[PDB]
Design an enzyme around this catalytic site. Structure first.
Site, PDB file in Angstrom:
ATOM      1  N   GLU A  49      -2.978  13.934   0.586  1.00 39.27           N
ATOM      2  CA  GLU A  49      -4.342  13.485   1.080  1.00 39.27           C
ATOM      3  C   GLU A  49      -5.015  14.596   1.513  1.00 39.27           C
ATOM      4  O   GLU A  49      -6.357  14.822   1.186  1.00 39.27           O
ATOM      5  CB  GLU A  49      -4.110  12.216   2.284  1.00 39.27           C
TER       6      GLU A  49
ATOM      7  N   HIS B  57       5.778   7.226   6.419  1.00 41.06           N
ATOM      8  CA  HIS B  57       5.372   6.757   5.083  1.00 41.06           C
ATOM      9  C   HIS B  57       4.812   7.847   4.343  1.00 41.06           C
ATOM     10  O   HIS B  57       4.781   8.940   4.861  1.00 41.06           O
ATOM     11  CB  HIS B  57       4.526   5.300   5.328  1.00 41.06           C
TER      12      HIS B  57
ATOM     13  N   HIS C 143       3.388  11.210   6.334  1.00 42.68           N
ATOM     14  CA  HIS C 143       2.941  10.765   7.652  1.00 42.68           C
ATOM     15  C   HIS C 143       3.819  10.353   8.597  1.00 42.68           C
ATOM     16  O   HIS C 143       4.502   9.204   8.424  1.00 42.68           O
ATOM     17  CB  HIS C 143       1.842  10.098   7.357  1.00 42.68           C
TER      18      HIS C 143
ATOM     19  N   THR D 172      -6.174   7.075   7.569  1.00 49.10           N
ATOM     20  CA  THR D 172      -6.554   7.335   5.867  1.00 49.10           C
ATOM     21  C   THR D 172      -6.469   6.046   5.136  1.00 49.10           C
ATOM     22  O   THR D 172      -6.849   6.184   4.045  1.00 49.10           O
ATOM     23  CB  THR D 172      -5.512   8.394   5.343  1.00 49.10           C
ATOM     24  N   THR D 173      -6.173   5.010   5.619  1.00 51.16           N
ATOM     25  CA  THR D 173      -6.392   3.593   5.236  1.00 51.16           C
ATOM     26  C   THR D 173      -7.063   2.682   6.265  1.00 51.16           C
ATOM     27  O   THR D 173      -7.126   3.034   7.156  1.00 51.16           O
ATOM     28  CB  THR D 173      -4.944   2.875   5.088  1.00 51.16           C
TER      29      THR D 173
ATOM     30  N   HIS E 114       0.789  -1.082   0.024  1.00 48.31           N
ATOM     31  CA  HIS E 114      -0.186   0.043   0.028  1.00 48.31           C
ATOM     32  C   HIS E 114       0.806   1.198  -0.079  1.00 48.31           C
ATOM     33  O   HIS E 114       0.714   2.334  -0.768  1.00 48.31           O
ATOM     34  CB  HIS E 114      -0.928   0.166   0.989  1.00 48.31           C
TER      35      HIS E 114
ATOM     36  N   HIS F 123       2.407   9.251   0.829  1.00 51.16           N
ATOM     37  CA  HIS F 123       1.363   8.978  -0.334  1.00 51.16           C
ATOM     38  C   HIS F 123       1.756   9.765  -1.262  1.00 51.16           C
ATOM     39  O   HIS F 123       1.969  11.081  -1.137  1.00 51.16           O
ATOM     40  CB  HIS F 123      -0.044   9.354   0.336  1.00 51.16           C
TER      41      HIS F 123
END
Ligand SMILES: [Zn+2]
Ligand SMILES: [Zn+2]
Ligand SMILES: [Zn+2]
Ligand SMILES: [Zn+2]
Ligand SMILES: [Zn+2]
Ligand SMILES: [Zn+2]
Ligand SMILES: [Zn+2]
Ligand SMILES: [Zn+2]
Ligand SMILES: [Zn+2]
Length: 257
Positions: A103, A91, A116, A195-196, A61, A93
């Site tokens: 995000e 991590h 994040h 957010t996941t 992911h 995005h």
């Protein structure tokens, strides 16, 4: 398995994760005209000098850099936070194009990526018990824009070829997370969620005003990763961001005017 594709993406997560339509979902758009300054917000205290990085991994992911969080080495305190929150991982995005990938959005501007740094509240003894609580976690969110290379990111970039596919990991010691911060620590904050999936409503969000700059060669390296494991069909790890969710009955507070 949930994902960021056509048939398993953010719009479908509500099926297996009904909390996807809950009251405190993240991310959100930050309207800088309604996110009013709040003079009672203390300044944010970030202590990363003793950070001990352990490993880096592609979990299908994103990729996580994990830290030793057995003791108060790297911690975040202050701002809207009570007590002490330990750094467990960071991590990112990111998009398939420079015009998207973050995000959170600021007045609907999307950035090219968002970092994040995930932290948990020592009041609960371990991460696993912390995520069950409204005040379990604090995530520090940092926007990325394309421009000059970020030297502090290079060690990450250089190891990405060794974890191209899901399930792969590499030893990753002595990485200094201060090299990923902007100069200013002005921030917005609101209460939200992971957010996941599983989308738990357990996070105090702290998002920085000032973005960092990374080079197009650095971001291209992110776009060469795969969502799939070795020997499955290639699906490039891109557009692994969830869009803005409804703010509902929540206030976003600014630390600066
Ligand atoms: Zn697929
Ligand atoms: Zn449905
Ligand atoms: Zn507005
Ligand atoms: Zn206005
Ligand atoms: Zn998974
Ligand atoms: Zn641990
Ligand atoms: Zn994240
Ligand atoms: Zn090893
Ligand atoms: Zn291999």
């Amino acid at each position: 398995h949930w994902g960021y594709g056509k048939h398993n993406g953010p719009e479908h997560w509500h099926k297996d994760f009904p909390i996807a339509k809950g009251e405190r979902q993240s991310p959100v758009d930050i309207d800088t005209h309604t996110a009013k300054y709040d003079p009672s917000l203390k300044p944010l205290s970030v202590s990363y000098d003793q950070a001990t990085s352990l490993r880096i991994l592609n979990n299908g992911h994103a990729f996580n850099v994990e830290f030793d969080d057995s003791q108060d080495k790297a911690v975040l305190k202050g701002g809207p936070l009570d007590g002490t929150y330990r750094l467990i991982q960071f991590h990112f995005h990111w998009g398939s194009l420079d015009g998207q990938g973050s995000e959170h959005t600021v007045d609907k501007k999307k950035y090219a990526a968002e970092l994040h740094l995930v932290h948990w509240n020592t009041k609960y003894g371990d991460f696993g018990k912390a995520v069950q609580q409204p005040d379990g976690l604090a995530v520090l969110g940092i926007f990325l824009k394309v421009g000059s290379a970020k030297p502090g990111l290079q060690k990450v970039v250089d190891v990405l070829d060794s974890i191209k596919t899901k399930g792969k990991s590499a030893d990753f010691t002595n990485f200094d997370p201060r090299g990923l911060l902007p100069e200013s620590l002005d921030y917005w904050t609101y209460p939200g969620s992971l957010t996941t999936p599983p989308l738990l409503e357990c996070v105090t969000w702290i998002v920085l005003k000032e973005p960092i700059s990374v080079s197009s060669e650095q971001v291209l390296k992110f776009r060469k990763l795969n969502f799939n494991g070795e020997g499955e069909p290639e699906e490039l790890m891109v557009d692994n961001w969830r869009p803005a969710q409804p703010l509902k009955n929540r206030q976003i507070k600014a630390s600066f005017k």
